[PDB]
């Protein structure tokens, strides 16, 4: 009459020896209700993945509760039986015929053990069960030589009539005291591919997020493994960690990794499915799951899609499930225990949608900032996945991987898997189309398929707050030495003069203005900073910050400056100011005025942002209103005029690297003297036009002739008027 | 939110007693810090008094929960740093220091930085640089109400309740409010110009009502506005064809139907032409202060204050000829010039013990005053016409 609908897994305590493969501590009432002999095999449904891990069954001492069951850590590791999963029980299957090979693999070892063996056969098949897809046991205490090793037993050649049983367990028959069929020790490779059994995710899979990975490791290990030390302080234990970031940036994968690597019990929810029409059903479910969380000392709770579960009060008062359940769960978890060991991880997205009623340091102090991976993280993930898929199926050197990572700048973490899989299908398709079903092992991975892959992938991750556009080195930096020296001075002062400023009280002006001609030397500065500074660089476009909705620009400004402040002492760059700055010359709207006042009162109002440095580059400086153009904020001014002869010559040399200067007979000195009124972008465009004219003569060329140079020079003019330079000089004089 | 509460509930018939809880100030934050430090005792950490005072002074907008947040963040950062560096050493030996607290206050980033009532940090008289006549005037104007309300009740004269501050945008407009708040020993209210402005129509009126009846419920005090010229001009500037309701509300609040004898209203504006003729009427805001550029004495005092960090004897400057040469500047201008001169003096060999006269001359010639005589002439004409 008990009718146990569901079961939950539980680790086997007390170690000892016991069964260790066929423990199966289930209450005798459940066994009687299943009309199955206790002294026989038992089957655990584990909801899905048929085969059911058929295993012999034993009896308990009436102390083991009915709800929890034990399946031994060996089977838990074999079948990835994560704690808190749904477990079911049903009738046993048919008796297996026999076992054939059962061969050891000696995982994470160099094999050649001979002495370390010491008759492993008795240990392997001195126990009931022995399921050949996997046995994982402790090293125990054998002879001298300490250490710890594991064994792979996956490979086998036995054939079973029913294909439903993917675990295809068989009986055990070996002779020993205190031998299979023609020895049982051979090979050392990885697990058998034909079974394709699931594997537990490890920390080695996650790459490019180290500075966060050890942070989260410590955040989950200090309370769980050291509860007494933290409780001695008496400052209350943290009961929540915020995992927020753009979708597909590697959050659920780390959730799975930490769930698999932790032996403690973990609670996993599927999200809004708990929400029910009955008002009290969700409350009862929440209080119940909290009861199992608090009754067991080790417990970790996972919550997902909190925004759907907990909508903002002001955003929409839909009703039904609302902040009532949030309040009751917060009250339940507030006083569940005094010290305990409980950590809650919230894998949410864009915390603006997260209800403001979920943010106090008392329970949710820990916040994890996840952003778009940079080129280094993308390259690291590429290397990790290449190592995972092994070199037996592909050939690729390091520089090609680096170039691929550099090419993909705005791509997301999941985009890397997208590209590799798309390259796989493209290679298979081209092989089938061309070679007419040739051996696909020799085709492997090439560059053409990957090139077509990122040509045709078309990701939907272009519009983001982060702007990780590709950078250039000092070779492309064509300008004046004084400008570079000033740049170095004002980017090295806050890095190694913070203590001096604090002692003196001068602090930092934190304001640099870059106004000049629209030719060049106004956009390459962002690359120069992002390259040489080695600090997290944020760039916001002018029209990008503008939005149709009223106040959207203001709130976006709020998030961008709050994240700049929270992202350590760094530099903020705004590309185009003269669209929102002219609130007096043009009528504009109230949103532009609100933006102007917000940016005026946030840079140096109320609170001072000493850590961050604010630099702004604008085309026409007269659009900036004099209300915010006050000494003490953005006081520094740089003329940054047209490039001189040296910068133009350097740009010409850089652009002429592909061509051969010796055969052309040009030193690029007379051309530089003639091309004095142009800009760096103008020089690049003229060089491109000259190259196009040269290659239109006889298709591909190895050199460029003078006639193309004169044709390009006469075809395109400077496009800049001297009166603009005079006006710039007049503005500089008044400043 | 008291506003979100049903106004039917919030009536004196049932809920006449209201307990107002505001943001803790420096003193309250220091008291809470000391109390919690004594709570977890010195057996696990060492924290001398002056470090606690410095931490409390550095805290401006933090809330009661923020102190606990900082404590927990510092403790956990100490734990991780000890585990990373000392390889699981005893945590009692590492205890608590100042650098982890500084890192915690840098990285805490509270979301309560927006508030209707601003607690502007206090400043002492010696740091304040002004003129003797203005100081005597403000002292008299603030001493009259507190110990003359009973005399005015019998006399019936009451108080002018209106003070207007118009002058150059250089200085003597912002730090004056801090000096008044410090010396008066009365709760101070600071609201920015565009802060009262809101996108929603009618939200500004509700904020105006909010601030005035909190001022009324906060005992006879002083109400100061950072700048009025951002909303006072309606016909002259035509600011989004709005603010007329705000102007009418502020006109009828000060002296409409009900008169506020206890409180004193002080106004500071950056330009006189933006004030409408309705406000420029005898009886309300009649008092006007020229509050011009600082004189020689104030500039000399500011230079002496800024030179305290450096050594005057080593530099050799007498702090008189520099003040005489820099006569057309302002207090903020003087501070900025001193900061830039210090930067120039430290560019050579990083930290220095003194600033040379050559660096001061470089600063003076590099940066101009930026002030024109036409605005001074207009201010003088307005003073004569007033
Ligand atoms: N940074 C990354 N590095 C490597 N693989 C990644 C990364 N981000 C995503 N992936 C791949 O894409 C899959 C989906 O990502 P993940 O499971 O982390 O979910 P998510 O989309 O970030 O989370 P959610 O659905 O909660 O928003 C991963 O299982 C992994 O295969």
PDB file of C-alpha atoms and ligand atoms in Angstrom, chain A residues 205-207 209 245-256 304-305 347-349 373 381 412-417, ligand 1:
ATOM      1  CA  UNK A 205      36.795  20.512 -20.915  1.00  0.00           C
ATOM      2  CA  UNK A 206      36.164  24.080 -19.734  1.00  0.00           C
ATOM      3  CA  UNK A 207      38.806  26.462 -21.044  1.00  0.00           C
ATOM      4  CA  UNK A 209      37.620  30.994 -18.063  1.00  0.00           C
ATOM      5  CA  UNK A 245      25.967  36.235 -18.814  1.00  0.00           C
ATOM      6  CA  UNK A 246      25.036  36.100 -22.490  1.00  0.00           C
ATOM      7  CA  UNK A 247      23.458  32.837 -23.678  1.00  0.00           C
ATOM      8  CA  UNK A 248      25.838  30.172 -24.923  1.00  0.00           C
ATOM      9  CA  UNK A 249      28.855  31.583 -23.068  1.00  0.00           C
ATOM     10  CA  UNK A 250      29.463  28.414 -21.052  1.00  0.00           C
ATOM     11  CA  UNK A 251      27.299  28.470 -17.916  1.00  0.00           C
ATOM     12  CA  UNK A 252      25.178  25.312 -18.064  1.00  0.00           C
ATOM     13  CA  UNK A 253      28.316  23.377 -19.019  1.00  0.00           C
ATOM     14  CA  UNK A 254      30.064  24.508 -15.830  1.00  0.00           C
ATOM     15  CA  UNK A 255      26.865  23.676 -13.938  1.00  0.00           C
ATOM     16  CA  UNK A 256      27.111  20.115 -15.253  1.00  0.00           C
ATOM     17  CA  UNK A 304      17.438  27.922 -13.795  1.00  0.00           C
ATOM     18  CA  UNK A 305      15.454  30.460 -15.850  1.00  0.00           C
ATOM     19  CA  UNK A 347      22.236  30.426 -13.908  1.00  0.00           C
ATOM     20  CA  UNK A 348      20.302  33.461 -15.105  1.00  0.00           C
ATOM     21  CA  UNK A 349      20.701  35.737 -18.132  1.00  0.00           C
ATOM     22  CA  UNK A 373      35.382  35.302 -24.605  1.00  0.00           C
ATOM     23  CA  UNK A 381      38.829  26.467 -26.207  1.00  0.00           C
ATOM     24  CA  UNK A 412      30.246  33.105 -28.841  1.00  0.00           C
ATOM     25  CA  UNK A 413      31.476  29.996 -27.035  1.00  0.00           C
ATOM     26  CA  UNK A 414      28.825  27.783 -28.626  1.00  0.00           C
ATOM     27  CA  UNK A 415      29.771  29.232 -32.022  1.00  0.00           C
ATOM     28  CA  UNK A 416      33.070  27.335 -31.800  1.00  0.00           C
ATOM     29  CA  UNK A 417      31.240  24.002 -31.556  1.00  0.00           C
TER      30      UNK A 417
HETATM   31  N1  LIG C   1      32.582  29.030 -23.626  1.00  0.00           N
HETATM   32  C1  LIG C   1      32.333  27.830 -24.160  1.00  0.00           C
HETATM   33  N2  LIG C   1      33.373  26.992 -24.373  1.00  0.00           N
HETATM   34  C2  LIG C   1      33.133  25.791 -24.906  1.00  0.00           C
HETATM   35  N3  LIG C   1      31.966  25.260 -25.281  1.00  0.00           N
HETATM   36  C3  LIG C   1      30.957  26.108 -25.059  1.00  0.00           C
HETATM   37  C4  LIG C   1      31.047  27.380 -24.516  1.00  0.00           C
HETATM   38  N4  LIG C   1      29.794  27.969 -24.435  1.00  0.00           N
HETATM   39  C5  LIG C   1      28.990  27.055 -24.921  1.00  0.00           C
HETATM   40  N5  LIG C   1      29.623  25.906 -25.317  1.00  0.00           N
HETATM   41  C6  LIG C   1      29.007  24.715 -25.895  1.00  0.00           C
HETATM   42  O1  LIG C   1      27.628  24.978 -26.090  1.00  0.00           O
HETATM   43  C7  LIG C   1      26.834  24.191 -25.175  1.00  0.00           C
HETATM   44  C8  LIG C   1      25.746  25.051 -24.581  1.00  0.00           C
HETATM   45  O2  LIG C   1      26.320  25.919 -23.580  1.00  0.00           O
HETATM   46  P1  LIG C   1      25.938  25.773 -22.055  1.00  0.00           P
HETATM   47  O3  LIG C   1      25.553  24.316 -21.801  1.00  0.00           O
HETATM   48  O4  LIG C   1      27.006  26.296 -21.179  1.00  0.00           O
HETATM   49  O5  LIG C   1      24.607  26.638 -21.933  1.00  0.00           O
HETATM   50  P2  LIG C   1      24.206  28.176 -22.041  1.00  0.00           P
HETATM   51  O6  LIG C   1      23.491  28.364 -23.379  1.00  0.00           O
HETATM   52  O7  LIG C   1      25.360  29.065 -21.801  1.00  0.00           O
HETATM   53  O8  LIG C   1      23.108  28.305 -20.897  1.00  0.00           O
HETATM   54  P3  LIG C   1      21.565  28.694 -20.720  1.00  0.00           P
HETATM   55  O9  LIG C   1      20.704  27.815 -21.561  1.00  0.00           O
HETATM   56  O10 LIG C   1      21.304  28.555 -19.215  1.00  0.00           O
HETATM   57  O11 LIG C   1      21.495  30.176 -21.106  1.00  0.00           O
HETATM   58  C9  LIG C   1      27.825  23.607 -24.171  1.00  0.00           C
HETATM   59  O12 LIG C   1      27.377  22.349 -23.681  1.00  0.00           O
HETATM   60  C10 LIG C   1      29.097  23.472 -25.008  1.00  0.00           C
HETATM   61  O13 LIG C   1      29.087  22.290 -25.800  1.00  0.00           O
END
